[PDB]
Amino acid sequence: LMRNIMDNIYRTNQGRSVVLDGQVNLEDLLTNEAAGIVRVKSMNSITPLETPQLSGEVYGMLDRLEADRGKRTGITDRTRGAAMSVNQLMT
Amino acid sequence: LMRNIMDNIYRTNQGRSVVLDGQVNLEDLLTNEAAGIVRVKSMNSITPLETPQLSGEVYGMLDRLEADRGKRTGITDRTRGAAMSVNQLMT
Amino acid sequence: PMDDEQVLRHLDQLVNDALDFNSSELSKQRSEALKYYFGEPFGNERPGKSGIVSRDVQETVDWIMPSLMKVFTSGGQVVKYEPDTAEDVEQAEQETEYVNYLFMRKNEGFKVMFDWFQDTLMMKTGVVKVYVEEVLKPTFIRKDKKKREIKVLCVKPENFLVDRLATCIDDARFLCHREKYTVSDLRLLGVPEDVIEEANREVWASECYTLLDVDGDGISELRRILYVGDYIISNEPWDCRPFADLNAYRIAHKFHGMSVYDKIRDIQEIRSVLMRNIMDNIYRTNQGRSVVLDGQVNLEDLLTNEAAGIVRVKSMNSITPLETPQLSGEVYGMLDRLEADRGKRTGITDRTRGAAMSVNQLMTAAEQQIDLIARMFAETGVKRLFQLLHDHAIKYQNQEEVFQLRGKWVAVNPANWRERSDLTVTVGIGNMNKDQQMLHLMRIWEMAQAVVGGGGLGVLVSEQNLYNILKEVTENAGYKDPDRFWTNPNSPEALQAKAIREQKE
Amino acid sequence: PMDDEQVLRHLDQLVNDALDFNSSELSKQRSEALKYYFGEPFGNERPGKSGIVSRDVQETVDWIMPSLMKVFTSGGQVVKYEPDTAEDVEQAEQETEYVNYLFMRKNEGFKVMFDWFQDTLMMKTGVVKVYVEEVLKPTFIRKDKKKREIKVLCVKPENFLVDRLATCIDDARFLCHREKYTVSDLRLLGVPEDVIEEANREVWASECYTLLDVDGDGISELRRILYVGDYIISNEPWDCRPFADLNAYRIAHKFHGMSVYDKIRDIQEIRSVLMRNIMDNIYRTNQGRSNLEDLLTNEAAGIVRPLETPQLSGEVYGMLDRLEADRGKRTGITDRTRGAAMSVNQLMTAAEQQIDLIARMFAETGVKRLFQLLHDHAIKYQNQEEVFQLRGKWVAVNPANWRERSDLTVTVGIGNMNKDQQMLHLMRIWEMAQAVVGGGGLGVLVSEQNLYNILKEVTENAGYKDPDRFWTNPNSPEALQAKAIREQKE
Amino acid sequence: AAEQQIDLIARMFAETGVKRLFQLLHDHAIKYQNQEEVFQLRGKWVAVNPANWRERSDLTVTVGIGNMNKDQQMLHLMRIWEMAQAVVGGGGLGVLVSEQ
Amino acid sequence: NERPGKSGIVSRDVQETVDWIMPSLMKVFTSGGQVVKYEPDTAEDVEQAEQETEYVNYLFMRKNEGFKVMFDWFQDTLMMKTGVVKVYVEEVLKPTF
Amino acid sequence: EANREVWASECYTLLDVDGDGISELR
């Protein structure tokens, strides 16, 4: 999931610009270099399609993944899991 | 992530303006110089596309990267990670 | 063997190679350090935009000064021989005063020491040279002729060419110290003729301390050469190099160490780039990118930098001004930790010093570095405080202590501590002021008053040791001798104040 | 060797070379700094349009002096000594109050301080000279003869010729300081003749501090020469040069320092051009592009008898705002009025204000100034006594220098300003004292004899230590009657 | 008031009035009368020989300082008031800005 | 991987971990000579045990370049990944003759 | 040059050069 998150960050940075054959021989320089302008030859249509963004709630599962470590053995996700929590909060 | 964030700020400063051939010989001066005027010749179409913005929640992951150092060794990301917290909160 | 002229060429080759390597590497690194200190743009700033560089090493060094100044520019009682019992009192503090009286308070104050710390902290190399000079102006009562005085000067470590494979002070096979030594000094030496380079022809000269063998035998001791321009030299065997080649940072095994630059460059970089990003974001939020076609508003909108009031195109009414989404204030909060970055690197002054009000000064100001840094910087001076010490110990003067008593004599030839003790402020016992204040006073004297209520004062500490109990309080406050004596170990007033009036009250 | 006349031509050549280089480049840089400070046109203003210039560094100066005024001109604790622990109240604090009572409040007050900071901060070279003069007008009770007093004056750093290869105060091989030294001074000296140049002939003179050899030997102590016009000169051995050559930014290895304009070139230039462009846009929008050339479309025309001029938006105001943020990131980080426990330590000194470190460097540079002053006052000054909280002071011509100063409690060192160290120390030590007093009693912890000092840091932070509230009671005949007689037998 | 350029116009207005004031200042700096000012309190010497000062200002109106009433009101009052009450609670009065 | 024409700025994260683990380690180790004891047989303890402990913590500590050897030992094992030190002997000189 | 910047090494290894079992360190 973290690898896919950073991959999504990358693909949002580039954007899928599909060029035709006969123009842009050098594969758009992978759409992200110190060029900025694409240039084809005489075509003016161009097909840059943007991959749709994602939602931040993905990171929410991140939290419960720690709870996954919480649910198996590591319930002390926090610093520690009357009479102020007797028996160190029932062990 | 920080390099990509400043690169995103950069590409928002310029914006991807793709010009045709025969007009704008000097590549818009990379779209940000102390010249400003575009000038083509007589055509008026022009194709400036603006890369969509991203979210500041990226910095949020930045925070948990400290918590990453928090999760590995530096659990005292803050100043410090009845009986008034004996043993300085159990070591 | 039988080398008298080939030594000149060999020293010339060593000086040239040291010039090349040392100049290039150390000079470029120290120049980067000084440029970061000054705060001008790094050179990667594109034209038309501010090149702001927020100074961070400046307040770093100004934050690490106070403790070091308190522990060096305060007396000379920091180090005690505790030597052999028979010859202890008449030599130990005699030499303590002798060295803290020559180097401090007779070698241009601490200004040489302060510039030397500055060189070892920013300019990446701190080292000073100790030499001797002859006094003039007799009465011709007050016949002061041929008097010899020991002086110390900053070597301009940019002119301190040396082999990089030494890693320690007493390991350099070739020590080069370059200075002006104007044509007046040339005439003082006796040469009427000069080098390629007005009496002050800004002639340049160098001094070489190196171990060699010119007598057709094994490698001899250190030799001093006045290699100016490969001309008449002042060749002389040398006893011990008067240097300490500080690094201030006990870096991995090399002669020269890192500096404030090599540890604060990342912090300064991130702070400067996020200032630049914040101002660029303010620019794009307060500007508004108006996407307008040509043929209407042909004059570039003046990069949208002029005030007219309304956009307007020509005859159409589309107008496409896009408003960039704003930011979040957490960056400023994120900005906060950059101060904590200094707080995590050098900035003790997030608080003045450092539940029980944040025990142990908030666990050393949230695990502050500089204590260790102070400690190591202390060791950075230790060998220096030894070397110059011996350079003093031979023969300087016959001055006395004024230190808490009047009347003392010359210290001629005792030892040199064969060490230095710097544990009272830092990673040693080193409990700094308010923490030890609180802990010691509160604990020990609540115990004492509890016993006094229960048992009494006679069984425990008496006034003779309430002396020390209150003297730790005073030394935390900073007034040991003058305002409150309280000594009372065994005094004539003790009998009439404790053994007569208190016992027979 | 045996030089009496070649020194004259050597100093003449040195003064001429320093004149050329120093005078030239200092003069142009300080002149452009002054022009930018006063809002004078840069010279690029085309004729026919207004040359209004918006000033920026003026606000920087107006926000940079008051902080120094609070952190320095508040009490006599500006510079501490902490010498050998032998006798601090008898000589160390004695000499400290001597210098801060004479140099300040007796030598043109603090006006010379402001002039020195102006020299180092705007006109790019801050340095002053310390000299001596003879007091006169006795009663011939009030017999004041042979008395001399030490003065300090700004050197007019426009007349402070010096070689650029110094990189330090005590490293220059040639120092030239040019003053008027009018005909009255010439008559006092005793010269009968004048120079190429009404009694006042506006004569000009110079003073040279150098290292040379007129006795046929090596470099002796400094030499002071009254080189005016290659005439009778006053040659005298001297111990150390009386100068401080402030740079105000801890500049690299060169004698002359920088100024505010030296870091506000670009920001002031862009602010000026942006304001000029804004007002020109307002003007052109008022006219708009439309036989007698239409009288600029806004004059006594009435009816023209025309493409729409392209229009813009005033949102450029944000630019203007970040100009202050420019100051916020150049020098005035307190873009606002001021940059747990509600922002402790004044929000960590307004987020590490660099004014504090500027004060630190100013103090450490003025350590040399106080060094020169204490030498000039301890060589032989007078039998003058102090009013430092108590009467009684011996002759101040043979104390010891102790030759080391400090600025511990004023700046970026421990050096927390008045309020922060005040409240912290007071709440901590007090609350613990009263807690144990409720536990044990008043005499259990630190006692009234040292509650003296505990209130004394409060007083020194307030400025009235001894006279208004003595509260000493350390060990006195009244102490025995009050602490050891009535308190013990109560 | 939304970048109202009447500010800059006021500026020139002000400086024009500046000259006006100087002129009338001269007309009062030569000889007007022995009258005194009621400026919140008694006391004003004869206004027939004031100094011209050869300078005026219009900073608090326009493109100069020119920050009007209520903006300074909220900003300054809020910030200095919170700072002063925090200092009074924690530090005190005399050490920083005091009753004086 | 920093392509030309664009900044390749690198933010170091290991350094804060290093400087957070170092000070607590120094506090727990470099604090008096009470860190290490011997507690030998009950009768033969006061004779040499604390005596040898003070001898070692007064020679190695406080006489053999302080804690710098062991501090650099910790630094080498913590960052450069190999912390190990070597012990040798040498002969004393400089008599009075 | 007398100081020929020579490099040296030291080896601790257990072996048997006495015609017997492997001895202690060398």
Radius of gyration of chain A: 25 Å
Largest interface: C-D, 88 and 92 residues
Q: Mind summarizing the main beta sheet of chain A? A: 2 strands, antiparallel
> Ends of chain A: how far apart?
34 Å
The fraction of residues in strands of chain A falls at: 5-15%
Oligomer category: part of a larger assembly
What gross morphology of chain A would you assign?
rod-shaped
Query: How many β-strand stretches of chain A?
Result: 2
Specify the helix fraction band of chain A: 25-40%
> Strand-and-helix sequence of chain A, N→C?
HEEHH
Total of DSSP H or I helical runs spanning 4+ residues of chain A? 3
* Biggest sheet strand line-up of chain A: 1-2
| Structural class category of chain A | mainly alpha
Characterize this entry briefly.
This is part of a larger assembly, with seven copies of chain A. Helix content of chain A is 36%, strand content 7%.
Give a verbal description of the structure:
This is part of a larger assembly, with seven copies of chain A. By secondary structure, chain A is mainly alpha-helical. Chain A has helices spanning 2-14, 58-72, 86-90, and strands at 16-18, 47-49. A two-stranded antiparallel sheet of chain A has the order 1-2. The first copy, chain A, is rod-shaped. Chains in contact: A-B, A-F, B-C, B-F, C-D, C-F, C-G, D-E. Chain A binds chain B through residues 9, 12-13, 15, 36-39, 41-42, 44, 46, 48, 50, 53, 56, 59, 62, 79-80, 83-84, and chain B through 1, 4, 7-8, 14, 16-21, 27-28, 30-31, 45, 47, 49, 51-52, 54-55, 57-58, 60-61, 64, 81-83, 89-90. Chains A, B: This is ORF.04.
